[model samples]
Target: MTPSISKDAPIKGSITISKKGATFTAYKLLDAIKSGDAYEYSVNSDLKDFFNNSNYGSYSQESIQKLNGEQVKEFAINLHKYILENKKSGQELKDGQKNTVDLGYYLVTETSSDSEGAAVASTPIIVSVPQVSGDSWNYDVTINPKDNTPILEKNIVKENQRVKTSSENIGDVVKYEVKASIPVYQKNAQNIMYKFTDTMSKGLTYDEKTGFKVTSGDKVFAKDTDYTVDVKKQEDGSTVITINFVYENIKAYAETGITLNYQATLNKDAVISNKENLGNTNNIQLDYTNNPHVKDSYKKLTDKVTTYTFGFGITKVDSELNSKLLQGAEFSVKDAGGKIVAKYTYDEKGQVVYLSGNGVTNSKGITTFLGLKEGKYFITEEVAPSGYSLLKNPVEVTITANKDESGNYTGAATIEISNGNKAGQIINDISEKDGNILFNVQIENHAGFSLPST
Candidate 1:
């Protein structure tokens, strides 16, 4: 007889029969399925329905074979029509995700009759319908598969913005929070190994005082008992913190989940006058067995952290004899040694472009130089505005800060600059003459003063 399977592949198991009396002789038609057999199944229910509805073609008239008198044959086979059709694809099998299959036996028997030869009876017998084994059959799958990995949602609380970089003296304290959950199947899992591994970039230093803390929901895990932490210093000057969880606490963590909160100090290693590499990342590693087919399976979920350095903004206004914004006034920035430091240009859209610590004023008479190092700089007026005299000396500005001994910033940096000018001798006025504009020109001078004609 042919076989039917509820899943994508045929079900396999061994069958044993016991005879009640010498008058009944029985034999198994086929060998029992061997032990340790495994098969993968897909969600294609149409295929399974065909096998279930057809009874594996076991009852076809061609399947009948000759049997002797007082002789019988009984064989057991597992037949289940309960396919988990509602669940989506890739869903892990767990408690509610499980279903039952029937273990039936094909029986062919002979019965004695008075007037004729022994009548024959052929039928299928159901022994029992049992739920699939949860411990041995269910695979380790994440309940929140979308966020299966550790998530690092970092914030620069003091700055109140997504700070990618900061100044050396700013003493920025970046706070990092990591969240992750254990697989639900590990609720009663034994010998479960779980840990979170974090690696920090060179620009940040792990705080040894607060260290790291993990909490399962509202319950805080005890240190040196519930978990142990190991900090390793890498040869490349980075740090790795590995938090190992105790086997006894795996169930509680798996059920309640965990959150890790920690802080890193921005140090002198932070990149200045440019973007620095201050990124930290972490992952959770879980190793356990949920099914017989999968032993010593390890899974990891990871996330990343990033931070950056500081910049300065420059605002230029009119020196007051002219209250309106001064346009076309050009300036060149330089170091204390009188060396040119920055230059700027305009694009098709009249947008100013420049390298670090360099830019030009816009229509508002304001220019900002970003990515400046925390030091002294000079701005010299290369070209004066139209009808205005240039400043005799360059404007000196300093980017400095004061910090506590521990590098915590205490106050904000202050910057200041001003420009003054005198009016020129030439004067002009405009009017329309004959469909064309005309300029009225005059030169201011004393009546008796002799002016050179050029």
Candidate 2:
């Protein structure tokens, strides 16, 4: 007896025969065919295993026949012809073969006497088969069985590109991006619902103009049709943004990831700290079929927000005539255009609170200015220490953020003060404090007493 296998066949089982000296055996086969970007697969076994393993039908010869040279040759030719006629066009099979004799299957036979006094034989077999019917299987093979939850990642950016921190000043826009991915093995899932709930800490206000956007790859999905964005106000006056993708909306993108982007302003409500940082976090959940249930399966990611503030220290030294510190010196800071900036102010508790643009030298000839933002500033001496002369020109102070080769700020700020020198004037000292620069000025006085007034 000869057998014809189906494209989708099981990996195990045996063929049986009733002839006195006849024996039958079944072999499993796996063949790969390249189809477009994906590879199609076909597996087959003998009569007893083909239907059970492949979950598809096969052909079996009921007539008894002897195996011989001509018969075997004819069988091979016929099998090749059948495959060529039914196989998909333009597909080439991959090299190598993975065949097994038996992996999962069972076979049994029975015999009974016929009414004509002739002996009759029969066989009964039991086998398991795949649930789905297809020549190839398509599913996520790299997903970990223990991790079948939604995925979330958060990023905060400035000017729509550079990363932003709590160090940003008020009124600056902090762009936020969140990427959420669905679990694998949900290709054919139904009633898929996805939700992303993000809660921002106090200080960051959601920008209504720069609303949220949902997208997959280059395709921008429509709001209300694909998903809904809701901004809710919490009892504590904080904000919560909830995005929901209805079952139908996410079903089409189960295999693809989605991204959410929006902007928020760093307002006066923002919290500032050097040792501690505020946070903006988001959590995502997906409800789908055939997904694993575990405590750590939910997606959660967080990014910190920090506001940036800088300061400076000015020192006066009598380097021209004497190497002593000079006191009673008055200085003013201005922008690049020569407009005076505000001086720093202290809170009631004595802690340095806010910064403006003016400072005066103390008894120690040192003046400290705190709570300043980044910019190009100029410092000029309006009044010199009691016995010293004023500077000839204003010193230029450049305070700006540092950038990498890619033009991305490395979260580092730069502070540079121009050189100060004038005949018979004080010389300034330069040093760094917590990444900020301190300038020291030195001046000289005449050794003789004052002459009579002109």
Candidate 3:
């Protein structure tokens, strides 16, 4: 059997066209995709469906695809900023201005199937605005990503709503059309959506092999095993789960909710490897009516309760946090302007919990933060060690009272040194060098766990 690509694998592809389509060059569109220099959009499924005009964007089944390579790269970049700022609560997407056209880059190509004019899955795109100096415009192009190699550049002409294509060749070089003026928007980040197949087979326990786990590209939730969701059984042979919060979109507004729909089928049942001379005919079949594969009577009933369980997770900005930064040091919260807004105290639903000068400092002058809420937090050392750098750098922390890898509410917090000077600093660090110790506390309705003190 041909192996399917792992869903967790990063997807990279170049633009390819059929012989029937009249295309200037293959690399023209393909280069942008391979390098990932172009912007990418989390193409709206509904919009893509309507525009692609197909059941699914199957290249072979549809024609009139949306977005060429260059067009998609630019539009996707711009649309990212637009969606982040405009989407309410970071999840809801609203329609555009009355008469304004939300023009995005999409490839239109002939369908692989005999059906012509039918829209298919188009490559994603973006629209970007370039910087302007007085009446002059300058668009920066990056050639060698390392030391920034010899790159070509140009400016947009006056009265031009958009710039045209570059004279670069298909494979050797790539071109883009940019706006003359750089608006308030700059490239922040792109939201990515991924899909994987899952088996909803009854009578079998769910795991990676059976179903899929949809998680963020950033492993922010690496330490966290449980997502903000729970599985429920439906009347039909299907299971449902809801991810009630989003990660990156949280600061934009209140948390948002999302639901995943899946259907369950009795794909496979318990296998009987045990063979005895007593009887080979004795097969496992608990309930042959509901489950088609069960050979034993007892196994069939037990398997009927089985359903493919899947996982859903929200990708937060902190998910991409450097492990080195988060390993040992704690932080205080800061605003967009990078000011020390406030210390992370525990705040329940409506009540406020204060963390007085309560954190403690160690011999090496490392301060360990203990007891905080489940959401994101900033860690900062109010006073730094004499010779050591101050803990001013922000490290986002997320606490949770929900279930953890052990399948229990392991919502506990502890601080440990991440780097050098473990025993050396833990011992005689000369207390004269700012040895004050303190702890800040925060919790939800239920009090958070307390750390072990020396």
Candidate topping lDDT = 2
Estimate TM-scores for all models.
Answer: 0.38, 0.44, 0.17
- Each model's lDDT: 0.41, 0.46, 0.24
C-alpha positional error of residue 112 in candidate 2 after TM-score superposition, expressed in Å: 49
Candidate 3 global lDDT: 0.24
Q: After superposition, how far is residue 267 of candidate 2 from its true place, in Å?
A: 7.2
Q: Of the candidates numbered 1 and 3, which has the greater lDDT value? A: 1
Model 2, 349-442: lDDT tens digits are 3344444445667676666554445677776777876765556677666666554575533435555544543422323333332222323334
lDDT of 3 by residue, 147-185 (tens): 101111122121442222111100111111111110111
Q: Give stretches of model 2 more than 4 Å off.
A: 1-171, 179-261, 264-296, 300-309, 316-331, 335-352, 356-375, 382-389, 399-414, 419-449, 452-454
Q: Estimate the TM-score for candidate 2.
A: 0.44
Give the candidate order by descending lDDT. Answer: 2, 1, 3
Q: If both were scored by TM-score, which would come out higher, candidate 1 or candidate 3?
A: 1
Show where candidate 3 strays beyond 4 Å.
1-16, 19-197, 205-230, 234-454
Stronger candidate by lDDT (2 vs 3)? 2
